Design a binder for this molecule. Structure first.
Ligand SMILES: Nc1ncnc2c1ncn2[C@@H]1O[C@H](COP(=O)(O)OP(=O)(O)O)[C@@H](O)[C@H]1O
Ligand SMILES: Nc1ncnc2c1ncn2[C@@H]1O[C@H](COP(=O)(O)OP(=O)(O)O)[C@@H](O)[C@H]1O
Ligand SMILES: Nc1ncnc2c1ncn2[C@@H]1O[C@H](COP(=O)(O)OP(=O)(O)O)[C@@H](O)[C@H]1O
Lengths: 239, 459, 38, 441, 121, 443, 198
C-alpha cells in the first residue's frame, strides 16, 4: 500500500495532518456526545429515564463507562479480577431469618445471586456437581485428550501483512499484530513482577491476576501441529 | 435503604384466574360445579386420570390430545392439571408457534422443552462454618523444620455468627486461602469441609464506620448457627443438566470469559450428551440419592407444529426418560402445516394421532354459560343484578362465551362513573355498544367496505 | 542447604501437618498470616 | 420408567437356524420380517459388507420400530446403533449433507487399545511447596504398600489434583499415570482429631499389597465422528457434546480415513462397523437421497436400516409421487422388508406382554375386550387403555382390571376413528381448513 | 506541529513538551492523559510531532532530518523540520449525523475495538 | 509454467487497427465477428479515455459465438494498467452479505486510485557485518556493502542491527534496504562467495553483484481500488478481509467519507482516479432486485463502465413470473446498448479450429482439419475444438506424428456431440429417469 | 534441537504502557550429542516455549520457519520411575544442535488458500487467537487465489515445486442448479482449472 492510504489519512480513524475530521470525531462521538460518559449517565439515573436500572445492576457509573468503551477482550481481562460474591451469599445468607439478603445495589443480579451451581460446589457428596461435569469427564475417559492426531492442516501460514515504506507502518505492525497488552494477558506476570508482588511489605495486584491463555484440550499436542516419531511406529512400520 | 410499600398487595386477574383444580370427588367423579369449573364433566374426569397417570410416575412419553372448538375450556383444563399436580411437578407450557427458533433447528427447541418438562430432585448435605472472623492465630510447631524461619502446626480462627462464637483449630494449609482471599479480622467468611478452604463474603457491617471512606460494601453477620450442617434439596430439570454440560459456566480463561460476555446462543445439543446424562442420572436414581420427577409438556395450538415436529415427537416419546405430553387443538379437518397436500383430523398427522389418548371438549349449555358468568363476576369482583347476569349470559349464548365475560370489566367501570357499585342492565347495554364483538364488527366491514375508493376499508 | 526464598512449604504425615516459611518471607506481607509481618 | 418398546429385549429368533419363534424376547408374529432382520444382524456382526440399505416397510404399527429396536437389543453395547429421526437432518448449524455425513460416521466405531500404569498405595507423607503470589508449585508424595515404599515427584497438575481430592496421610489412593486421574478408596487409620473442618469420614481399608506400580490394558471405543471433531480443531473439543461443530472440511476426513486404516493395519485400532437406523425416512428430501446414494459406496459405510409408513407418496422437494415416498434410483439400492397387520391372536399376545411389562393384572374378560378394541381401534390405543384402566381400577381399589375399568377407559378416551367422527359431527364449531368457525350456541 | 525540543516531567503525569519550527519555539504544559497518548506514539526528543491540543489527538510525523546522520543506517523516517508557524488555529465546521451517534454509542469503534481484527463473532 | 492451456488462451487482444478501429479478419487470435469487434473497440476507447461514467453494454448472441472471446479480447487489450473485474452473476448470491452489497463491492473494485510514491532504496552485496553485543545485544555495528561500481561502510543504529540479525544477513548476501522503513529483503546470494554458504544445498541459486549507485530513488506506482479503501477502513485489520472475504455489509457512511477523501486527493493532485470496467457474465442470472439497484449505481461519477453477456431469448426474469428479451427487464434495457454476435461461416470455423490447434501442440493433417470443420458446422465449434485434444491423444497412443482422419473418427465415435446425446436420451427414455421420476431397471 | 541446559529471561521496565513489565528476550542453552549453543530468543519465540511448558532438562525442537517450539521429552539423563506423571524420557539429540532438514510435501492449492485465509502458523496474536476460535469456512476472495497462483508460480520457477493438476468428479450432477452451472462457465475458463467429470 502507498503511505498516502496506509499512513497519511487514507485511514479515516487515524488523526493527523490531512485528516482533520478524525480527531474531532473521536472526541465528540466517544466523550462529548457519548451516552455512557458518567456526566451523561448521571443525568438519566432516575425515574423512568434510561439509566434508572443502573442503581441495581452491581456496577458503578465508572464501570458502565469502561464496559461501553473497552472491547470484549479487554473486558474479559477486567472480568478476571472479580469475585463471585453473590454466589457466596447463597451459601451464607441461607436461613429464613437471612431473608435471602442481597446488596440492594445488586438487586437485579438475580440469576447469579441464586443458581444451583454454587451450592453443588459445597455439598459433601457431589451428586449435582458430578452431573454438571459429565461432558468433560466422559471426554477424558475416552482418552481423546491423549490419542494421537489423525489429521492436521497440510499447509500453515502466518498472517498477511501490509507492506508500506514508512516507519509508522512498522511501529503499527508491532502494536497490533504483536499487541503487548493482549500478549501480557495471555501469558501473565513476569518473574520480577512475581518477586515484587511476593517480597513487598503489603500485597499488590497484577495486571492479569494469572495467565489467561486456556489449557489446551489435547494433553500432548497442545498449541502446535508438530509431531514426533515413536517406538510404536518404529516397531510396526517394518514388517 | 429501600423504602417499603405498606398499603396493599392484592392480585391481578386473568382469563383463567377462577380455575382452581379439576373439581373431582375422591371417587374421581366430577362435581357439576366445583373448583371454578362448570360442566365438562367427562373431560374433567379424563383429565383426572391424566393427573393420576402423571402423579404415579410409572410411565414415559404417553400423549394426550385435548380436542374441541375454541372457547370450550381446553387451556382451562390444562391449567387445572398443572394446579392438581402442584409446583413440585414440572409443567412446561408452550404454543406450537414457540418452536420456530432462529438460533437452532426446531427439533432442538422441541427437545429442550421436552427435557425442561423432566425434573430431577437431588438431596445432599451442606456442611460449612460461617461467621465474621473474630481472631486469627498461628500455633508454632513443637518440631520446627530446619532452615525455615517459622513452622506453624495449627491456624486458629474465631468465627462469630448472630447465634454463637467458635474457635476453629484449622489445618495450617488454609494460609493459602486467607492470603488469596485477603481475609481480615472482621470479614465474613465461610469454610467448606469438602475442601477445607475458605471464601470471603465481605466485610461485616459491624465495621461500617471504621473509616469515612472505604471502597467496599458491608455485609450483615450470618444469622444462622456458626456451624451449618443440614440436608439441602436441589431441583433441576434435565435441560438444566444439558446446558450445564454443553455451556460450562465457571471457566477462568480468556475464551470462557469472552464467552460469558457475548450473546449466549443456544446450540443443537447431541443425543450422545443427552444419552450420557440419562445414563449417569439413572446411576444416582438406582443409588437412591436422586429421584426423577416426570412432568408435563403442554403444547397449545399443537396444529402449529409441522410434520417434521411430529415425526420427531415419535422418536422423543419412545425414549425411556420422557414427560407426559399434552396437546391441544381446535382445527377440525385441516392441512398439516408442513405437508400442503395432506389433510387430517385435528390437523394432527394420522400416523402420530394413533399415539394419543384423545379427550373431547364439547360446547356449553345456556345455564352453564350463566353459571360461568357468575363465577367470573365474583372473581373479577364485579357485583351484578340478576337481570344483568341474564343479559350477559344472553350474549354468551348468542355470540360467544369469551365476549360476554369480557364485558364485565367495562360495565363495572361504567357503573361506578355513575356512582353505582352494582352493575345493572343499563351498564351492560352501554358496554355492549361501546365494545363490539367480532361478528357485529364484521358486518360493518361488509356494509361500509362495500367500496374502497375513499372512506372505505382496505381490501 | 537453604530453602527457596519464594516458596512456602506445607507437609502432612502421621503426626498431622505443619507449614514452614522462609525467613526471606517473614517481614513481608506473606509473613502477616504467620504473625511475622513487616 | 416403562416406555413403548421396553418389553422388546431381543429379536426372538433361534441363533442357529435364525427361525423366528412365534413369541420370544417380547416380539410376536412378523416372522418373515423377523427372519430377514435376523439375517441383517449376521451381516452387521460379521462386518465384512459395507453400505447395504434395508427398508422396513408396512402400515402404521405392525412393529417396524419394534423390530429395529429388537436388533439394537441383540447387538449389545460394543456396536454403534445410531438412531435418526429423519427430521433431525434439517439444521441451521450445518447442511443436510453434513448432518448425514456426521450420522454415518457416528455409526462406525474405532476400538483403541491402550496400556496404562496405575499406582495404588497408602499415603505416608505428602509435601507441597507453593510460591507466594504466583502459579509456581512443586511437591513430593511418599506412598506405601505392605511390600514397597517410594517418594514420587509431583508436578503442578498433580498438586492441583491432590488438593482437589484432599489427599492426606493415611489415605488409600490410586493414580492412573496415563490420564492423571487420582481417586481415593479409603483410609488405613482414623482421621486425625486435632484439626477441625477435616471433612466426612471415609471407608476403612487395609493397606494395598505387592508392588506400587502395575500395568493395565484399557480399551476405548470412539466414533469416526468423534475423531473428526477432535482433529478439525486445536481447541473446543466440547463440540463433541454441544453439536456446534460447523461443516467439517472434507480433507480432514480424508486424512482420518487414511490414518484409521493405518491404525488398523498397525494393530492400534479395531474398526467396529455398526448401523444407522433412520426412522420415517420419507421425511428426507431429494438432495438427501442423492447424497445417500454415494455415501453408501464407501468401504467405511455402515449398514443403513430404514422405516417408512408411506404408500405411493410425494417425495419432499419434488413435484411427483413415488412408492414409500422414496425415489426410484434410491430404491434400486434398497432391499425391502415388509411388516403386516396383526391377527387377533397376535394382538392378544402383544397386549398380554404390554400388561406384564406395565405390571397390570388384567382379568381374562378385560383382555378379551381389549383384544376386540385392538381389532377395531388399533394396537396403540388398546395399549393406552391398559394404563388407563389400571388407574381407574386402583381408584375404586379393585385388585384387578375388570371389564368395568376397560369400558370406563373406552368411554373417557376416544380412539382415532371415533375422534374423526366427533370432528365430522362438529365441523361448524371446530375451525375449518378455510378458518371459518361459529362460536354461538 | 514541530520538532520535539524537550520532554520534562513537572508533576509527582504532567510534562512540559518543547516544540520547534523554523519560525520559533513554544512550550506546552501537558495533561497527564495526552502525555500518555504522546508516549504511546513512540515520541522522543528530535522527533517531529503533530498535536491537536483541543481534541487531544497526536501523531509522530517522523524524526527531524537534522538527526539524519545520527548513524549512517537506521530504520527511521527522517523528515524536514516544519517551515511554518509551530502553532496554527483553524475554524472547522464539522458535520455528523444522528446515525454516526447511533453507531458510536452502540459499540466500541475503531482503535478501541482491536479484537475485531479476528473476524467471525 | 503454472498457466495451462484453457479455452481462451489463444486470445491476445481484440485484433483491431489502433488508428481506425477497423477489425482485421483475423489477428491477435480473433476471427470474424467484425461488426461486434468494432463495437468492442469503440468501448475500449471509452474505457481508456475515462471521461464517460456508467455506460452499460450488453453482448447478446447465441452460445459459442465469441461473447466471452470478445470479453477476453478487451481485458487483454487494456492490460494490467486498468481495473478489469470479472463477475459471474452467480457470485452475487452470497451468504456473507446481501446481493446489493455484493454488487456495490463489485462496482467499487472497478474504480482505481493511482498513487505515485518515491523511496530511497539501498541495494548491494554485503562485504562484511560486525556487531557488538556488549551482552544484551545490538549495542553497535558496521555494515560494508558494495556494487560492481562502489563500496561503502555504514555505522548502524540498533534497530537496523535488529533488522540485520532478524534476517540473518551474512557476508555475500545481496540485499535491498527500503531505508524509509528499514525492512531488508535478501534478493539473493553472490556467486563469488558460494563456498561460504556451507549450510546451503546444491539446489541453491546464485546472483551476480548489483550495479551502479548503492542508493537510488526508486519510484513506485500503486493502484488501489475504492473497495480496498472501503475494506481497510472497516475494522482494525480490515485489509485481511480482502483475502479471507469475511467483509460484512460495509456501512455506507464509510463509503461516503472515502468518496469525499478521494475527490480531495484528486483536486490536491495527491492521487488520480482510474475508472475501470466491470464484466458481468450471464447477466440474466441476476434478479429484479439486482437490476433496480444497478439502474442507479450506474448514475454515480464513480461508476465504471459495465459490460454484460447473455445467451437468452425472450425468457423469464428471475424473481418475477414474466418474460422479457435477453431475460432482462425493459426497465433496465432502456439504459443499455446491445452488441450482437452472429454464428460463424465454415471458413471462420476452419480458422478458429486452426488457431486452437496451433495454441495446443497439435500437428493436424489437412483432411483432419477439413473433417473437424464439417463437424464444426454440424455439431458446433466447441465440440470440434474438444475433439482436437482427443484426436492428439489417440494419435499419440498409436505413436503417430500427425493427427489424421483416423484419429478424428475415433474421437467422433467415442464422444457424442450434444445433438447425438439428445437423440441418445430420447431413444433411451425408459431407461433414464424422466421428469415424472419414473424409470425401468429391467432388461 | 537439544537438551535445555539453562534458561534465563531478561526483562523490560515499561513505564506507562499500563500492562506492567514485559520480557525482552530469553537466553536458553541447547546441548546435543555433538555440540552446544546458547540462543538469545525473541519474545515471540519465548511465548512459543511458554505455550510448550518447557523446563530445564527437557529436550526441545525449535522450527525457525514458524518460530514454533515442540517439547520432545525429558532428557534420558533424568530417566527415573519416581515421577507421578507419565513423562517421555528421550535420549539427547544426535548430531549438531542446529540442522537443516529437507522434506517433500504434497499440498493442493486449496490447502494454500485456506492456510492464508485463516492463518495459524505464526506466533503473532492473530495466529494465536485463530487457534482458539471455532473453525469456520469463509468466502475466500479471488484476490487471495490469484495471489497464491503467484506464490506457487515462484515455487515452480525456483524449481522446488511441480504442478500436479487432477480431476473433480461431480457425481449426481443433476442435483446442481442453474447458478452452479452458470458459475462453471466462469470457473472452467480459468487457466489452471482441473478436468471435470460429470
Ligand atoms: N368449564 C368452565 N368453567 C369455567 N370457566 C370456563 C370453562 N370453560 C372455559 N372457561 C373460561 O372461558 C374461556 C374459554 O376457555 P379456554 O380454555 O380459553 O378455551 P380454549 O382453550 O378451548 O380456547 C376462558 O376464559 C376460560 O377460563
Ligand atoms: N410384533 C410385535 N411384538 C411386540 N410388540 C409390538 C409388535 N408390534 C408392535 N408392538 C408394540 O406396539 C407399539 C407400536 O409398534 P411400533 O413399532 O411403534 O410401530 P411402527 O411400525 O409404526 O413404528 C410399540 O409400543 C411396540 O412395542
Ligand atoms: N471469433 C473468435 N475467434 C477466436 N476464437 C473464438 C471466437 N469465437 C469463439 N472462440 C472460441 O471458441 C470457444 C467458444 O466461444 P465462447 O466465447 O466461449 O462462447 P460464448 O459466446 O457462449 O461465451 C472459446 O474457447 C472461444 O475462445
Amino acid at each position: 500500500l502507498p503511505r498516502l492510504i496506509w499512513c497519511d489519512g487514507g485511514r479515516l480513524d487515524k488523526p493527523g495532518p490531512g485528516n482533520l475530521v478524525a480527531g474531532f470525531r473521536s472526541k465528540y462521538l466517544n466523550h462529548m456526545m457519548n451516552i455512557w460518559t458518567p456526566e451523561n449517565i448521571r443525568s438519566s439515573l432516575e425515574g423512568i429515564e434510561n439509566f434508572t436500572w443502573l442503581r441495581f445492576v452491581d456496577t458503578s457509573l465508572q464501570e458502565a463507562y469502561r464496559a461501553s468503551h473497552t472491547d470484549v477482550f479487554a473486558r474479559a481481562v477486567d472480568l478476571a479480577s472479580k469475585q463471585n460474591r453473590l454466589g457466596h451469599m447463597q451459601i451464607v445468607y441461607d436461613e429464613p431469618e437471612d431473608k435471602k439478603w442481597t446488596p440492594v445495589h445488586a438487586l437485579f443480579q438475580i440469576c447469579e445471586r441464586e443458581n444451583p451451581k454454587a451450592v453443588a460446589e459445597i455439598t459433601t457428596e457431589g451428586v449435582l456437581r458430578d452431573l454438571m461435569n459429565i461432558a468433560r469427564v466422559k471426554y477424558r475417559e475416552l482418552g481423546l485428550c491423549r490419542l494421537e492426531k489423525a489429521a492436521r492442516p497440510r499447509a500453515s501460514a502466518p498472517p498477511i501483512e501490509v507492506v508500506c515504506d514508512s516507519r509508522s507502518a512498522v511501529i503499527e505492525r508491532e502494536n497490533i499484530m504483536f499487541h503487548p497488552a493482549m500478549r501480557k494477558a495471555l501469558f501473565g506476570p513476569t518473574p520480577s513482577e512475581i518477586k515484587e508482588a511476593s517480597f513487598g511489605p503489603r500485597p499488590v495486584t497484577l495486571y492479569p491476576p494469572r495467565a489467561l491463555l486456556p489449557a489446551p484440550d489435547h494433553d500432548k499436542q497442545r498449541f502446535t501441529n508438530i509431531t514426533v516419531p515413536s517406538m510404536a511406529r518404529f516397531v510396526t512400520d517394518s514388517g | 435503604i429501600s423504602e417499603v410499600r405498606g398499603n396493599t398487595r392484592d392480585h391481578r386477574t386473568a382469563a383463567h384466574t377462577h380455575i382452581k383444580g379439576l373439581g373431582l370427588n375422591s371417587s374421581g367423579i366430577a362435581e357439576k360445579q366445583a373448583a371454578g369449573f362448570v360442566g365438562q364433566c367427562a373431560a374433567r374426569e379424563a383429565c383426572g386420570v391424566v393427573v393420576d397417570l402423571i402423579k404415579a410416575h410409572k410411565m414415559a412419553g404417553r400423549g394426550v390430545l385435548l380436542a374441541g372448538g375454541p372457547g370450550t375450556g381446553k387451556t382451562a383444563l390444562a391449567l387445572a392439571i398443572s394446579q392438581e399436580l402442584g409446583t413440585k411437578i414440572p409443567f412446561c407450557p408452550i404454543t406450537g408457534s414457540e418452536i420456530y427458533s432462529t438460533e437452532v433447528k426446531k427439533t432442538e427447541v422441541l427437545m429442550e422443552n421436552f427435557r425442561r418438562a423432566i425434573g430431577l430432585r437431588v438431596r445432599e448435605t451442606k456442611d460449612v462454618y460461617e461467621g465474621e472472623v473474630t481472631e486469627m492465630t498461628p500455633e508454632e510447631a513443637e518440631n520446627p523444620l530446619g532452615g525455615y524461619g517459622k513452622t506453624i502446626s495449627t491456624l486458629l480462627i474465631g468465627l462469630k455468627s448472630a447465634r454463637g462464637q467458635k474457635k476453629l483449630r484449622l489445618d495450617p494449609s488454609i494460609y493459602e486461602a486467607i492470603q488469596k482471599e485477603r481475609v481480615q479480622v472482621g470479614d465474613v467468611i465461610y469454610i467448606e469441609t469438602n475442601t477445607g478452604a475458605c471464601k470471603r463474603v465481605g466485610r461485616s457491617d459491624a465495621y461500617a464506620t471504621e473509616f469515612d471512606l472505604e471502597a467496599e460494601e458491608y455485609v450483615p453477620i450470618p444469622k444462622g448457627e456458626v456451624h451449618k450442617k443440614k440436608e439441602i434439596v436441589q431441583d433441576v430439570t434435565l435441560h438444566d443438566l444439558d446446558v450445564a454440560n454443553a455451556r460450562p459456566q465457571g471457566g477462568q480463561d480468556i475464551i470462557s470469559m469472552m464467552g460469558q460476555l457475548m450473546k449466549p446462543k443456544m446450540t443443537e445439543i447431541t443425543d450422545k450428551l443427552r444419552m450420557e446424562i440419562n445414563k449417569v442420572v439413572q446411576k444416582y436414581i438406582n443409588q437412591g440419592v436422586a429421584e426423577l420427577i416426570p412432568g408435563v409438556l403442554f403444547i397449545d395450538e399443537a396444529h402449529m407444529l409441522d410434520i417434521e415436529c411430529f415425526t420427531y415427537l415419535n422418536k422423543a416419546l419412545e425414549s425411556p426418560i420422557a414427560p407426559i405430553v399434552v396437546l391441544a387443538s381446535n382445527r377440525g379437518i385441516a392441512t398439516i402445516r408442513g405437508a400442503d397436500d395432506l389433510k387430517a383430523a385435528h390437523g394432527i398427522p394420522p400416523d402420530f394421532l394413533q399415539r394419543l389418548l384423545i379427550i373431547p371438549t364439547h360446547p356449553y349449555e345456556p345455564d352453564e354459560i350463566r353459571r360461568i358468568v357468575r363465577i367470573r363476576a365474583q372473581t373479577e369482583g364485579v357485583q351484578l343484578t340478576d337481570a344483568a347476569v341474564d343479559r350477559v349470559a344472553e350474549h354468551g349464548v348468542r355470540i360467544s362465551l369469551r365476549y360476554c365475560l369480557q364485558l364485565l370489566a367495562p360495565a363495572s367501570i361504567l357503573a361506578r362513573v355513575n356512582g353505582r357499585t352494582q352493575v345493572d342492565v343499563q351498564d351492560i347495554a352501554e358496554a355492549e355498544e361501546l365494545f363490539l364483538d367480532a361478528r357485529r364488527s364484521a358486518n360493518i366491514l361488509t356494509s361500509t367496505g362495500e367500496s374502497g375508493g375513499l372512506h372505505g376499508f382496505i381490501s | 542447604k537453604r530453602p527457596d526464598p519464594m516458596m512456602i512449604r506445607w507437609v502432612n504425615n502421621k503426626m498431622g501437618s505443619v507449614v514452614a516459611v522462609p525467613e526471606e518471607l517473614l517481614g513481608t506481607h506473606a509473613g502477616v498470616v504467620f504473625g511475622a509481618g513487616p | 420408567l416403562i416406555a413403548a418398546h421396553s418389553h422388546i429385549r431381543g429379536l426372538g429368533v433361534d441363533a442357529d437356524t435364525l427361525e423366528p419363534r412365534p413369541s420370544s424376547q417380547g416380539l410376536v408374529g412378523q416372522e418373515k420380517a423377523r427372519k430377514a432382520a435376523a439375517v441383517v444382524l449376521e451381516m452387521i456382526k460379521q462386518g465384512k459388507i459395507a453400505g447395504r440399505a434395508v427398508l422396513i416397510a408396512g402400515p402404521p404399527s405392525t412393529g417396524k420400530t419394534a423390530i429395529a429396536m429388537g436388533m439394537a437389543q441383540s447387538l449389545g453395547q460394543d456396536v454403534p446403533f445410531t438412531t435418526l429421526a429423519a427430521s433431525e437432518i434439517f439444521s441451521l448449524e450445518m447442511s443436510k449433507t453434513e448432518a448425514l455425513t456426521q450420522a454415518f460416521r457416528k455409526s462406525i466405531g474405532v476400538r483403541i487399545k491402550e496400556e496404562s500404569e496405575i499406582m495404588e498405595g497408602e499415603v505416608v507423607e505428602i509435601q507441597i511447596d507453593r510460591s507466594v503470589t504466583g502459579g509456581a508449585k512443586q511437591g513430593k508424595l511418599t506412598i506405601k504398600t505392605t511390600d514397597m515404599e517410594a517418594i514420587y515427584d509431583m508436578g503442578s497438575k498433580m498438586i492441583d489434583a491432590m488438593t482437589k481430592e484432599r489427599v492426606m496421610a493415611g489415605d488409600i489412593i490410586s493414580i492412573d499415570k496415563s490420564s492423571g486421574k487420582i481417586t481415593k478408596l479409603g483410609r488405613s487409620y482414623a482421621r486425625s482429631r486435632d484439626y477441625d473442618a477435616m471433612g466426612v469420614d471415609t471407608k476403612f481399608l487395609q493397606c494395598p499389597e505387592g508392588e506400587l506400580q502395575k500395568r493395565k490394558e484399557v480399551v476405548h471405543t470412539v466414533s469416526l465422528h468423534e475423531i473428526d471433531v477432535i482433529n478439525s480443531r486445536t481447541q473446543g473439543f466440547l463440540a463433541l457434546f454441544s453439536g456446534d461443530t460447523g461443516e467439517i472440511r472434507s480433507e480432514i476426513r480424508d486424512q482420518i480415513n487414511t490414518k484409521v486404516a493405518e491404525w488398523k493395519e498397525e494393530g492400534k485400532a479395531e474398526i467396529v462397523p455398526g448401523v444407522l437406523f433412520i426412522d420415517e425416512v420419507h421425511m428426507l428430501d431429494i438432495e438427501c437421497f442423492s447424497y445417500i446414494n454415494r455415501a453408501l459406496e464407501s468401504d467405511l459405510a455402515p449398514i443403513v436400516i430404514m422405516a417408512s409408513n408411506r404408500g405411493v407418496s410425494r417425495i419432499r422437494g419434488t413435484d411427483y409421487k413415488s412408492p414409500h415416498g422414496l425415489p426410484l434410483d434410491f430404491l434400486d439400492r434398497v432391499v425391502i422388508i415388509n411388516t403386516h397387520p396383526y391377527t387377533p391372536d397376535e394382538l392378544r399376545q402383544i397386549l398380554s406382554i404390554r400388561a406384564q411389562e406395565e405390571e397390570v393384572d388384567l382379568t381374562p374378560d378385560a383382555l378379551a375386550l381389549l383384544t376386540k378394541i385392538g381389532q377395531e381401534a388399533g394396537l396403540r390405543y388398546a395399549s393406552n387403555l391398559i394404563t388407563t384402566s389400571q388407574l381407574i381400577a386402583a381408584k375404586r381399589r379393585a385388585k384387578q382390571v375388570g371389564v368395568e375399568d376397560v369400558q370406563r377407559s373406552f368411554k373417557l378416551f376416544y380412539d382415532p376413528a371415533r375422534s374423526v367422527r366427533f370432528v365430522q359431527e362438529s365441523e361448524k364449531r371446530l375451525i375449518g381448513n378455510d378458518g371459518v368457525v361459529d362460536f354461538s350456541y
